[PDB]
Design a protein around this ligand. Structure first.
Ligand SMILES: *[C@H]1O[C@H](CO)[C@H](O)[C@H](O[C@H]2O[C@H](CO)[C@H](O)[C@H](O[C@H]3O[C@H](CO)[C@@H](O[C@]4(C(=O)O)C[C@H](O)[C@H](NC(C)=N)[C@H]([C@@H](NC(C)=O)[C@H](C)O)O4)[C@H](O)[C@@H]3O)[C@H]2NC(C)=O)[C@H]1NC(C)=O
Ligand SMILES: *[C@H]1O[C@H](CO)[C@H](O)[C@H](O[C@H]2O[C@H](CO)[C@H](O)[C@H](O[C@H]3O[C@H](CO)[C@@H](O[C@]4(C(=O)O)C[C@H](O)[C@H](NC(C)=N)[C@H]([C@@H](NC(C)=O)[C@H](C)O)O4)[C@H](O)[C@@H]3O)[C@H]2NC(C)=O)[C@H]1NC(C)=O
Ligand SMILES: *[C@H]1O[C@H](CO)[C@H](O)[C@H](O[C@H]2O[C@H](CO)[C@H](O)[C@H](O[C@H]3O[C@H](CO)[C@@H](O[C@]4(C(=O)O)C[C@H](O)[C@H](NC(C)=N)[C@H]([C@@H](NC(C)=O)[C@H](C)O)O4)[C@H](O)[C@@H]3O)[C@H]2NC(C)=O)[C@H]1NC(C)=O
Ligand SMILES: *[C@H]1O[C@H](CO)[C@H](O)[C@H](O[C@H]2O[C@H](CO)[C@H](O)[C@H](O[C@H]3O[C@H](CO)[C@@H](O[C@]4(C(=O)O)C[C@H](O)[C@H](NC(C)=N)[C@H]([C@@H](NC(C)=O)[C@H](C)O)O4)[C@H](O)[C@@H]3O)[C@H]2NC(C)=O)[C@H]1NC(C)=O
Ligand SMILES: *[C@H]1O[C@H](CO)[C@H](O)[C@H](O[C@H]2O[C@H](CO)[C@H](O)[C@H](O[C@H]3O[C@H](CO)[C@@H](O[C@]4(C(=O)O)C[C@H](O)[C@H](NC(C)=N)[C@H]([C@@H](NC(C)=O)[C@H](C)O)O4)[C@H](O)[C@@H]3O)[C@H]2NC(C)=O)[C@H]1NC(C)=O
Ligand SMILES: *[C@H]1O[C@H](CO)[C@H](O)[C@H](O[C@H]2O[C@H](CO)[C@H](O)[C@H](O)[C@H]2NC(C)=O)[C@H]1NC(C)=O
Ligand SMILES: *[C@H]1O[C@H](CO)[C@H](O)[C@H](O[C@H]2O[C@H](CO)[C@H](O)[C@H](O)[C@H]2NC(C)=O)[C@H]1NC(C)=O
Ligand SMILES: *[C@H]1O[C@H](CO)[C@H](O)[C@H](O[C@H]2O[C@H](CO)[C@H](O)[C@H](O)[C@H]2NC(C)=O)[C@H]1NC(C)=O
Ligand SMILES: *[C@H]1O[C@H](CO)[C@H](O)[C@H](O[C@H]2O[C@H](CO)[C@H](O)[C@H](O)[C@H]2NC(C)=O)[C@H]1NC(C)=O
Ligand SMILES: *[C@H]1O[C@H](CO)[C@H](O)[C@H](O)[C@H]1NC(C)=O
Ligand SMILES: *[C@H]1O[C@H](CO)[C@H](O)[C@H](O)[C@H]1NC(C)=O
Ligand SMILES: *[C@H]1O[C@H](CO)[C@H](O)[C@H](O)[C@H]1NC(C)=O
Ligand SMILES: *[C@H]1O[C@H](CO)[C@H](O)[C@H](O)[C@H]1NC(C)=O
Ligand SMILES: OC[C@H]1O[C@H](O)[C@@H](O)[C@@H](O)[C@@H]1O
Ligand SMILES: OC[C@H]1O[C@H](O)[C@@H](O)[C@@H](O)[C@@H]1O
Ligand SMILES: OC[C@H]1O[C@H](O)[C@@H](O)[C@@H](O)[C@@H]1O
Ligand SMILES: OC[C@H]1O[C@H](O)[C@@H](O)[C@@H](O)[C@@H]1O
Lengths: 125, 125, 125, 125, 62
């Protein structure tokens, strides 16, 4: 074993260290959007449960939490934009997701065009 | 650390890179058939809602969309083949699914023998 | 530079050449068991896909290959020992792995006690 | 090739041998917590299956094992702390994980504040 | 792909997306000092072809 073999080894380590590591940011973005989607799907179940008890939808998250919806996930900002006897609009996004998601009782849970780095939508697209 | 250990590492990377990656096409085919099945189950709900209002089934998708059926999913081609006061036939398929699906009020939503690469059925099997 | 320094260099080369080379057989055994495990995990996905289409499991590998399971890996011998409407047993092993692996829909993919140098299990342990 | 090149080679081997080896304990801790999480997610599926058959949850692991839950994993200690017609609390931890995990039908499977080196929680946090 | 987070094609690697559709892709890549061209498709995964890197790149997935 000699200095030229060791330089080849060092050179190949430098190559493998550069290429065998994934884009961690891109992976976490897609996982983060899954958290937002899952949390809005839960908020939708709890809006229906609140509708069973009260014949109206909630405008405030604490009513949904009472019924069994968990704390808003870490780095997820969630808001109920509006609610009535017959409809709701909810918006949620992760600071390191891709886009804001919206939920309404007609469109279900769906992704908006607005990036999470922009201020949240004021209404359902 | 030496060139022979590094060649073993490269050899084992080549093995794991070959075997630890799933068949993505096969996975997406089964998910795509789920989209088609779900969209036909929705079209069936909306055919019944149109029947509530009009005492007949629709032949045109825009009537179902008015009532609340969403846009045909990406890469899904959907058609209402025929309709009357008493029956309908609907056909749908995803360009990367397995087979065309049919829906009728007697048979429910069911898969046909026709592959999505062939032209769509002209009628319910 | 003199003959005594060169004999020291030769002596130390003989030492480093003896100790800095890994056990290649042991490394390849663990990689080979990973190939077998990965191939059985794929065969399990394709048994479920065949179950989607046929309401039964396959007894023959060519049906799984049609659906998208790849050729049995080099030096891996794979067999479907039995199958029915409700269960399967599959066995696989690499001629230079450690042990035969078994797969069933209840136990998942798991390693058996039988070394790959012995004849393959006739059934799931 | 001379004694000074060979001393440089030995010096650089000593460096690479020190830095190119990962913290194995830290890696195994995160894998071990995955085993505990996965086993509690399975115990939760089997609590629901026992609820299908008996209209109550189990307090004893052997009932879950009968239904299809596998042996408690190596080095995982699992306990069903309490159960009733309407709720359960289960606790599990790996002796070389990070913390004890808890499972309840409301909170799902979640990690507690208690390190695995401390005695297991007597109840769900 | 680069917009989404895929890095610049590596030094001396020539990469091409040969074809793509709603349902499939074929990609080919090779290093001028590698052994052979590699292909990627969503069914076969990433796999090595028979074509040496000194020959012109495959026009399709083998
Ligand atoms: C998200 O989940 C995590 C999981 O670990 C965690 O549970 C979070 O913290 C919350 O849960 C805590 C532990 O249970 C606390 O409950 C805590 O308070 C929340 O729950 C209170 C009871 O439901 C709620 O309180 C109220 C009430 O009972 O109505 C609401 C008002 O404060 C009300 N005051 C008035 C004037 N009406 C009463 C008040 N009554 C009077 C006369 O003053 C009480 C009885 O003294 O209290 C709280 O408002 C709150 O929702 C909660 N933590 C936080 C940060 O609030 C969980 N996150 C949330 C927000 O649920
Ligand atoms: C699938 O879902 C996605 C979700 O993002 C999206 O909503 C798609 O696009 C559709 O939705 C758009 C936003 O709401 C538009 O509504 C758009 O138009 C569709 O809806 C129209 C109103 O229902 C419909 O129009 C009609 C009508 O109101 O009856 C139909 C005829 O054009 C009619 N004309 C005549 C001559 N009778 C009238 C017309 N009147 C006259 C006198 O000219 C209007 C009032 O001027 O308009 C449209 O035909 C259409 O269904 C829609 N986009 C597309 C591409 O059409 C959604 N996809 C669909 C098709 O719904
Ligand atoms: C493992 O993967 C590697 C990847 O490089 C490689 O693909 C291996 O080789 C296989 O793939 C080849 C290239 O596609 C060939 O397909 C080859 O044949 C296999 O596939 C055939 C078509 O699916 C299959 O054939 C059948 C059929 O289509 O049903 C089966 C019978 O032979 C049948 N005969 C009868 C009498 N029923 C027909 C026959 N019909 C008649 C009337 O005779 C044909 C239409 O003439 O053919 C083959 O049996 C086979 O599975 C395949 N190579 C080998 C070695 O078989 C791949 N390994 C396998 C085994 O898939
Ligand atoms: C974790 O998984 C590994 C996977 O390799 C392995 O399977 C472990 O060992 C278990 O599985 C073994 C092979 O199947 C054995 O089944 C073994 O026993 C377990 O299963 C028994 C049958 O379900 C169970 O037995 C019972 C019963 O059938 O009810 C329970 C009582 O002992 C009962 N006795 C009484 C007095 N009621 C009967 C008893 N009857 C009488 C009248 O005496 C029998 C019929 O004679 O037996 C066992 O209790 C046990 O769960 C099992 N190994 C171990 C260590 O128990 C697997 N680990 C477990 C615990 O399942
Ligand atoms: C491989 O990685 C290395 C890492 O060091 C390096 O990043 C390489 O260079 C690239 O990255 C640079 C630094 O960020 C530059 O981004 C550079 O440009 C690339 O990225 C541009 C922005 O994404 C892209 O541009 C576009 C666009 O934003 O859409 C594409 C068109 O040019 C488009 N024009 C038109 C007419 N539609 C616009 C254009 N708009 C108009 C109206 O003219 C702009 C806004 O004026 O620009 C570039 O095309 C390019 O991808 C990039 N370097 C090179 C050599 O391109 C990195 N390699 C690549 C190719 O990403
Ligand atoms: C949901 O609660 C909101 C505060 O958490 C807010 O109060 C919203 O407005 C209501 O105000 C009171 C209840 O607090 C009223 O009696 C009505 O429920 C409603 N008022 C109006 C103007 O509609 C409430 N829901 C929404 C969005 O209406
Ligand atoms: C459903 O709408 C079709 C066009 O979107 C088409 O018009 C079908 O045929 C109808 O034609 C008019 C309505 O447009 C008639 O008054 C009847 O509803 C019907 N005509 C016939 C020949 O049945 C219509 N439904 C179907 C398939 O009949
Ligand atoms: C799976 O295919 C086997 C040959 O590749 C073999 O044929 C097995 O036995 C079947 O035989 C025919 C199908 O070829 C029958 O109609 C049944 O599917 C089955 N027969 C019996 C005895 O069960 C077949 N699967 C297994 C293991 O049954
Ligand atoms: C679950 O089984 C436990 C032993 O494995 C224990 O027996 C628990 O207590 C029960 O005791 C008998 C059943 O063995 C009773 O009829 C009830 O099921 C229950 N008794 C009490 C005090 O609740 C049993 N489940 C739990 C935690 O109750
Ligand atoms: C939910 O109910 C709890 C008690 O169970 C508290 O009253 C809480 O304030 C409620 N949330 C709201 C504000 O509706
Ligand atoms: C559905 O109703 C909308 C208005 O709500 C439009 O009139 C649309 O044309 C209708 N679809 C059809 C063609 O029946
Ligand atoms: C799998 O299907 C192919 C055609 O797609 C061949 O028919 C092949 O014989 C099949 N395998 C078996 C034997 O089931
Ligand atoms: C689970 O059932 C088996 C038989 O299938 C044994 O009876 C075993 O004792 C059962 N476990 C318990 C104790 O509930
Ligand atoms: O102030 C009470 C008022 O609060 C809110 C609504 O629920 C109304 O129905 C109710 O009358
Ligand atoms: O042209 C009007 C005609 O259109 C269609 C059917 O709905 C008929 O009942 C109706 O009379
Ligand atoms: O011989 C036909 C026979 O083959 C096999 C099984 O699939 C049976 O269900 C079938 O009837
Ligand atoms: O001793 C029998 C007793 O055991 C336990 C519970 O399941 C009770 O419902 C039951 O009556």
């Amino acid at each position: 074993f000699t200095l030229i073999e060791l330089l080849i080894v060092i050179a190949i380590i430098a190559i493998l260290a550069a290429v065998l590591i994934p884009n961690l940011l891109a992976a976490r973005k897609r996982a983060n959007d899954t958290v937002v989607t899952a949390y809005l799907n839960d908020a939708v179940k709890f809006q229906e449960m609140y509708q069973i008890d009260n014949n109206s939808y909630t405008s405030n998250q604490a009513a949904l939490i009472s019924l069994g919806l968990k704390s808003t996930p870490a780095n997820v900002t969630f808001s109920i934009v509006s609610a009535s006897a017959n409809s709701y609009c909810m918006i949620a996004g992760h600071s390191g997701g891709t886009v804001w998601f919206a939920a309404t009782p007609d469109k279900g849970v769906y992704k908006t065009n607005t990036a999470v780095t922009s201020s949240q939508p004021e209404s359902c697209p």
